[PDB]
Design a binder for this molecule. Structure first.
Ligand SMILES: O=C1C=C/C(=C(/c2ccc(O[C@@H]3O[C@H](CO)[C@H](O)[C@H](O)[C@H]3O)c(Cl)c2)c2ccccc2S(=O)(=O)O)C=C1Cl
Ligand SMILES: O=C1C=C/C(=C(/c2ccc(O[C@@H]3O[C@H](CO)[C@H](O)[C@H](O)[C@H]3O)c(Cl)c2)c2ccccc2S(=O)(=O)O)C=C1Cl
Ligand SMILES: O=C1C=C/C(=C(/c2ccc(O[C@@H]3O[C@H](CO)[C@H](O)[C@H](O)[C@H]3O)c(Cl)c2)c2ccccc2S(=O)(=O)O)C=C1Cl
Ligand SMILES: O=C1C=C/C(=C(/c2ccc(O[C@@H]3O[C@H](CO)[C@H](O)[C@H](O)[C@H]3O)c(Cl)c2)c2ccccc2S(=O)(=O)O)C=C1Cl
Ligand code: CA
Ligand code: CA
Ligand code: CA
Ligand code: CA
Lengths: 121, 121, 121, 121
């Protein structure tokens, strides 16, 4: 099990102690408030009224919580995943990233508290 | 396990099949968008900028996801709970409710998709 | 969780901290060597070559591990159960018992090391 | 979650769908009756009164259930394991074998019904 924070101003993303292996079933629960620039802040689901202007994950709103599993493409996490299995041939360490446009994280603020654990399978 | 919708305009709240027993460990994951009256919609965490004007749950923002186990006070759920254990002497059927001011659920819209399951204890 | 030893001479049976509730899913693992009289010892499955001369559990060999959920009838356990759901209307505390004949427990020796834990559901 | 039979006369061992990884936690429940030659059968714990004439697992009775993880030395399984964590540097596929002497499996009979599953870590 892993528990830490993901800073919005972290373009590199926060690496976790979890390593997803084929067949694993995980569960994620994220909370907190972050911002992709503006003064106000949004939840893990992001800003639904802001358009996709070249985010790292086009399957989630700007300011939403996404993740990389090893060397895979970005994967939507949002509020979290419940007893979830990854697509075929996806394996590696889980890495939580704040969904924002590359090279803009500079003005970001806030963070997300995230819990990750492997369920029984 | 349980999975269903929780309407923001349901003052009575949505009842689930889950019944929390002493010692049980549960996990919740909530997603979706709802509104406590206005036009825009907030996540399960609610509206952090909206002041508490008499919510059924004072430990959560307006438009946040709360719950009631049996017939206790409202307990914050927000984005969800991760391998969580209720306080002492708390037990009964789990009821999900939209955190709003009593008698105002009229102009509410949207809903939350919620998953509930018990983890090994 | 619960971990303890069930004595073969204990006619009343060992009472665990596990309280089975409707819907629950449990897993049991039993090991060790015990006897229903002789100098020989058998595993949690009991002695397959000994007739039923009035055992508290007729669906399990003599010298085998059984249990009673609350105030129900004896239920076979043996080596243990894997993610197991109790029959309809079965609920209560869990008591582990060495399968023998009422009043004969006197000359019994040995014990069973048993682990019981509520599983995910 | 694997479930199958471990034939007694199968020397090379029964290969399961499980691929244990570092940090993993598993639970095993073995049941049934087998034999290493005689006409009488023993449980997953084996025959406690038969000496070691060159077993493949010197830490478990002859006729007991053992397993090999990747390229490790045989490990006693017996009645099973409860929320068990493999030793340091132990990883790979799982192979359940009937503990015996190399080349004698010829006259073995019976098998063990076994369940394997990863618990929430
Ligand atoms: O020509 C323009 C038109 C609208 C506009 C507003 C705007 C633009 C961006 C923005 O946040 C930026 O978003 C990107 C990536 O998503 C990056 O994170 C930047 O660092 C952020 O500053 C905000 Cl908060 C506002 C605007 C205003 C009102 C309604 C809609 C918009 S829109 O851009 O979404 O269309 C800015 C320019 Cl230059
Ligand atoms: O005298 C007033 C001053 C401001 C004001 C705005 C307001 C108030 C409430 C509100 O949502 C209501 O919230 C309650 C429960 O929390 C209930 O759900 C009602 O049905 C909702 O209408 C909204 Cl959307 C707006 C106002 C405007 C701008 C900034 C802040 C506020 S305030 O919320 O702080 O009051 C309304 C009145 Cl009458
Ligand atoms: O007519 C009979 C013929 C043989 C016989 C032997 C026997 C009986 C009991 C026994 O263990 C006792 O079992 C009872 C209840 O199950 C109680 O637990 C006592 O405390 C125990 O001592 C044993 Cl180990 C043996 C016998 C002898 C040789 C082979 C098989 C048997 S048999 O019992 O399987 O028939 C008893 C009777 Cl009545
Ligand atoms: O000189 C002897 C004296 C007793 C004896 C009995 C015996 C030996 C082996 C056996 O099964 C064999 O076990 C080996 C592996 O350990 C292998 O599986 C063979 O294929 C099997 O045939 C049986 Cl069923 C019986 C015996 C009897 C009672 C108690 C102890 C023993 S002993 O094994 O210690 O000797 C065999 C010989 Cl050669
Ligand atoms: Ca930015
Ligand atoms: Ca309202
Ligand atoms: Ca007896
Ligand atoms: Ca043999």
């Amino acid at each position: 099990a892993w528990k830490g924070e993901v800073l919005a101003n972290n373009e590199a993303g926060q690496v976790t102690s979890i390593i997803y292996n084929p067949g694993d079933v995980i569960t994620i629960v994220a909370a907190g408030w972050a911002s992709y620039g503006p003064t106000q802040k949004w939840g893990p689901q992001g800003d639904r009224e802001h358009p996709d202007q070249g985010l790292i994950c086009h399957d989630a709103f700007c300011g939403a919580l996404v993740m990389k599993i090893g060397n895979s493409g970005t994967i939507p996490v949002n509020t979290g995943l419940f007893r979830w299995v990854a697509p075929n041939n996806v394996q590696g360490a889980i890495t939580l990233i704040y969904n924002d446009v590359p090279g803009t994280y500079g003005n970001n603020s806030g963070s997300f508290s995230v819990n990750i654990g492997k369920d029984q399978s």
